[PDB]
Structure formats: structure tokens, C-alpha cells
């Protein structure tokens, strides 16, 4: 994990189906494929991902002050660690199969749903600058205060201006 960004989303984002946690993690990582015999690598790729994460522990890190503050030579602060969960709850409207009257017919039920990544992109061994730009754009768009909305990549797209192929239904 070359880069790591922990962002705090607001209540409106936290209520979305894809965002079922109060903290979103954005990271860039490098992957390799090696032959089974030895460490002979065959290819290298960069992956950019965003995940809803949960707290699983704490760790000791150095303290980094900001301009209106001053720090001791060896001051340290504690920060939480995060890990990808498996299922997160959500409340939906439902009905009581064993209701007895008009006051306990409508209820709210809790259902657990599968967690999926928000972003998952793969870049080749070259074009590390493109992966870095994508990571920075995702982080900035999260910092804008809304959901992640833009996913368009020019490399993975159909040719524009090809009328004999774009006339088919897509709606």
C-alpha cells in the first residue's frame, strides 16, 4: 500500500447503500505475478481501490504539528487501524407475519448486505502517473463533500463517431 487516505463522510453519504460506514479508505498498491519456481516476476500492475472500513485496533505514530501548533522532539499520538469488513447492516420497512393488531403490523427490520468496493481500477507497469492522477482525483472528489460520481476512463471506451456501431439500442 504505497498511499493511504482516510476520509470522514457526512450523514447523507453514510445513508447510501454503497457507503455503510462513517469512514472511507482510498489506497494505491502495486501487484506482481511470479513464476512458481522462484521469484522471477512476469508483470507488474498498480491498483486503485476505495473501501468502507471498520476499526480493528490502534497503533503508535509520530505527531505532525500544524502551523498554529508546536510539538515536542519525540511526541507521539495514537491513531486507529482499519480493515475491510464482510457484511454491514441496513434498516428497511417490513411487515410482522405474526401481528395481533393495528399497532404492531408495520415494523423496521435489519438486514445484512454484502460489501463491495467503491472503486477498482488496474493500470499497467507503465503509466504510473495515470494511476497517481486517478487516485488524487478520487481523493479530491471525496473531499468535495459528496459521493464518488466520475468513473470515465478514455482508454477503456468505445470509439466515438462510429455511427454504424453506435446506432444500436443502449438505453
Amino acid at each position: 500500500m504505497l498511499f493511504k487516505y482516510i476520509h470522514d463522510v457526512n450523514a447523507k453519504v453514510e445513508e447510501g447503500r454503497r457507503y455503510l460506514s462513517d469512514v472511507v479508505r482510498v489506497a494505491l498498491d502495486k501487484e506482481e505475478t511470479t513464476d512458481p519456481d522462484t521469484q522471477e516476476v512476469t508483470s507488474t500492475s498498480y491498483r486503485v481501490t476505495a473501501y468502507p472500513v471498520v476499526q480493528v485496533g490502534e497503533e503508535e505514530v509520530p505527531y505532525i504539528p500544524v502551523h498554529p501548533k508546536t510539538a515536542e522532539p519525540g511526541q507521539k499520538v495514537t491513531v486507529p487501524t482499519y480493515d475491510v469488513p464482510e457484511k454491514l447492516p441496513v434498516l428497511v420497512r417490513g411487515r410482522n407475519p405474526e401481528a395481533t393488531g393495528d399497532y404492531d403490523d408495520h415494523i423496521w427490520v435489519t438486514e445484512e448486505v454484502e460489501v463491495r468496493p467503491l472503486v477498482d481500477e488496474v493500470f499497467k507497469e507503465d503509466e504510473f502517473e495515470k494511476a497517481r492522477l486517478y487516485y488524487e482525483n478520487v481523493a479530491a472528489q471525496l473531499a468535495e463533500g459528496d459521493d464518488i460520481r466520475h468513473y470515465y476512463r478514455k482508454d477503456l471506451d468505445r470509439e466515438a463517431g462510429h455511427y454504424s456501431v453506435s446506432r444500436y439500442p443502449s438505453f
Partner: protein, 156 residues
Amino acid sequence: FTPNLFLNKTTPLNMNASSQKAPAPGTLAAEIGTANDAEFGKQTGGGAGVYKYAVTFNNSHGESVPSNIVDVTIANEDVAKGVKLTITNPVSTAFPVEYIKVYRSEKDGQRLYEVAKFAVTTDNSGGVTEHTDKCEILANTYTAFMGEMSEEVIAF
């Protein structure tokens, strides 16, 4: 006398979370304490009996799911000694935890009610909070308030 319709008794335990942003459930361990000022013997029939204990984890967003239920047997000579509770934080909570609620049943009862409310010692995952119960509040009871209602005493 001013009867108030929203002044209720101890809230009975709820088996479902109040909101989706509430923390995760944890674990509870209970045993006879070592204090010497417990008030279990103030009941009419005495403090001897069997009691049930359960806890829930809380934040500013809602109430979590009840933890495991533990049965504690109190003898007639242990009424002066409280109950020491060991509360463990959830391993992988998705929302932070801020305080705890303790639920106790009646003497030789089945249904639990809220009797205590205090903050956590630490919010780290897997943290341990130790509390000693002295039976300050009896389950399934009411509360009333009396005082001078004037601007010179109380205001908003």
C-alpha cells in the same frame, strides 16, 4: 400534582438495534464483587436470589444489540458485596462506541430493565471496562421529582 405522560419507568430491554449507525455488540462477564456497601438487602424479601445481566453499547446515533445474558447467584451473606462486571469492546465495530447501559432483571425474574448508564473507559477495539453494581436502582420501578418551579431556581 402534575402527571406527565412521558415520565415512564425503567425501559425494558430491546432485542433490536435502534438505528443502523449504532455500534456492534460485545461480550459480558459477571461475578460476585468485593465491595462492602451494596444495597441488595433493602428489598422486602432480601437480596437472596438469581439475577440476569446484559449490556448494550451506545453512541450518539443509537443503541446496539444486547450482549450475552449472564446469570448471577447471590447468597444471603453476599448481599453486602456488589457484582463486578467485565465489559469488552467489540472487535470490529463500524461506528464508535461512547457509553454503556446495564440491564438487570427482577429478583428471580425473566425480563430485564435498564438500571445503569455510564461511559466507557476506552474506545479501543477489545478494550475492557470494569464496573461494580451496588443495586442503586431496582428493576421495574418508577421515579418522581419535586421542587420549586420558579425562574429564580430553574430556567431554560
